[PDB]
């Protein structure tokens, strides 16, 4: 198994209310876990636990290897669009091109005279919310890792663009990779190997889309 949580309870503040309560799941290598739930349910906190920023007060956690994290808040640093996506990782033309195509950034980049050398984050170009989200997603996906933590990465995208990139990037380009995707969208839960729905820290549902349909 690649990631396990067993009876996990955790607190951000000593003596506060638990942010996660008796959470259970397992992800095998190469699978996709969808993590859903309302605002404040604990989804980002669950990712933080996997990244070692929050320790369990009860329960056990298993995860090994290197992590790539995509924040739900998209961000850009001063530099070219290519530099923002590679972000200090060694460069490979084929890998880079595959990521930007899977994130629909080829269209955006082709429109600039400077192409992949267009400069971001320095007062020239002002990116849309959807461009910044796809660049942030591409940055996380370009990075080689054992586990990809994609926290609501489709911000500002219309539902068809979100669907297309979920399929081209999360399902096809990343098909061999262990993935945790924070998302509420029905198709994403249906395509996931497992679903975890959080509500106020607790496991509202854990299982498969098919199991939920049978209920
Ligand atoms: C990430 C984080 C969260 N919290 C608290 O934990 C609860 C759950 O918050 P969440 O996990 O961010 O909820 P979410 O499911 O990701 O919500 P959303 O991103 O709005 O969909 C909230 O009390 C937050 O204050 C902290 O105190 N410190 C933190 O660093
Ligand atoms: Mg969050």
């Amino acid at each position: 198994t690649e990631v396990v949580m067993e009876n996990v309870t955790a607190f951000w503040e000593e003596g506060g209310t638990p942010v996660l309560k008796d959470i259970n799941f397992k992800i095998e290598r190469g699978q996709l876990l969808a993590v859903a739930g309302s605002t404040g349910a604990g989804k980002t906190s669950l990712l933080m636990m996997i990244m070692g920023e929050l320790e369990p007060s009860e329960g056990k956690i298993k995860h090994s290897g290197r992590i790539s994290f995509c924040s739900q808040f998209s961000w850009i640093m001063p530099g070219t669009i290519k530099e923002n996506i590679i972000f200090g990782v060694s460069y490979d033309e084929y890998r880079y091109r595959s990521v930007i195509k899977a994130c629909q950034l080829e269209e955006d980049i082709s429109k600039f005279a400077e192409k992949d050398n267009i400069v971001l984050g320095e007062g020239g170009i002002t990116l849309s919310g959807g461009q910044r989200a796809r660049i942030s997603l591409a940055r996380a996906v370009y990075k080689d890792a054992d586990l990809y933590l994609l926290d609501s990465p489709f911000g500002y995208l219309d539902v068809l663009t979100e669907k297309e990139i979920f399929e081209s990037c999360v399902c096809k380009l990343m098909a061999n990779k262990t993935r945790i995707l924070v998302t509420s969208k029905m198709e994403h839960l249906k395509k996931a190997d497992k679903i975890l729905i959080l509500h106020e820290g607790s496991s509202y549902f854990y299982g498969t889309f098919s199991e939920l349909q049978n209920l």
Side-chain angles (χ1 to χ4, degrees), residues 1-12 14-25 27-28 30-52 54 56-124 126-171 173-175 177-215:
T1 74
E2 195 66 35
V3 190
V4 179
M5 280 197 189
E6 172 184 305
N7 301 127
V8 168
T9 291
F11 303 77
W12 278 117
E14 171 146 1
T17 171
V19 59
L20 296 166
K21 299 163 83 296
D22 190 18
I23 296 310
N24 296 276
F25 69 85
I27 321 179
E28 313 291 342
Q31 288 183 329
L32 170 64
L33 174 66
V35 176
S38 61
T39 180
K43 309 182 294 294
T44 300
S45 297
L46 186 161
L47 301 187
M48 292 292 147
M49 290 197 60
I50 302 173
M51 296 186 279
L54 172 59
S57 59
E58 294 177 8
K60 331 287 173 42
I61 182 178
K62 170 182 188 201
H63 66 274
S64 178
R66 173 37 167 87
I67 294 171
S68 186
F69 171 66
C70 183
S71 174
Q72 78 190 81
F73 301 113
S74 68
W75 54 272
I76 301 296
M77 283 292 280
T80 66
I81 190 167
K82 172 177 289 178
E83 289 165 344
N84 263 280
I85 288 167
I86 308 297
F87 207 63
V89 174
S90 61
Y91 180 84
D92 175 73
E93 178 70 21
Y94 178 80
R95 188 183 176 91
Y96 171 74
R97 291 289 162 207
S98 301
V99 173
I100 58 171
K101 287 196 202 139
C103 292
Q104 300 191 4
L105 288 164
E106 77 292 309
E107 301 294 18
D108 305 79
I109 291 165
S110 76
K111 307 300 186 181
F112 314 122
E114 318 94 301
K115 295 295 184 297
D116 305 83
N117 297 329
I118 186 76
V119 177
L120 315 176
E122 295 173 23
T126 300
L127 297 168
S128 75
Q131 288 173 323
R132 294 162 47 82
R134 293 180 290 121
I135 291 159
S136 285
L137 174 58
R139 182 185 307 114
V141 165
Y142 181 83
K143 196 188 191 24
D144 188 51
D146 295 314
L147 175 64
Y148 291 83
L149 309 179
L150 307 180
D151 197 348
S152 199
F154 304 123
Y156 297 96
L157 305 179
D158 62 280
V159 292
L160 176 63
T161 298
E162 173 181 40
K163 164 191 180 66
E164 290 169 350
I165 297 179
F166 170 73
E167 296 176 359
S168 62
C169 184
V170 175
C171 296
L173 184 65
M174 301 177 80
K177 313 279 192 78
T178 311
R179 294 149 286 163
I180 303 188
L181 169 68
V182 173
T183 185
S184 60
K185 297 314 168 65
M186 190 184 288
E187 184 187 323
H188 312 175
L189 314 198
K190 173 180 169 189
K191 289 262 202 159
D193 298 282
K194 297 289 164 59
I195 302 161
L196 174 60
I197 303 174
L198 297 177
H199 180 67
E200 305 180 44
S202 299
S203 185
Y204 185 83
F205 176 82
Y206 173 73
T208 64
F209 191 85
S210 82
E211 279 162 349
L212 190 35
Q213 199 44 65
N214 293 335
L215 290 179

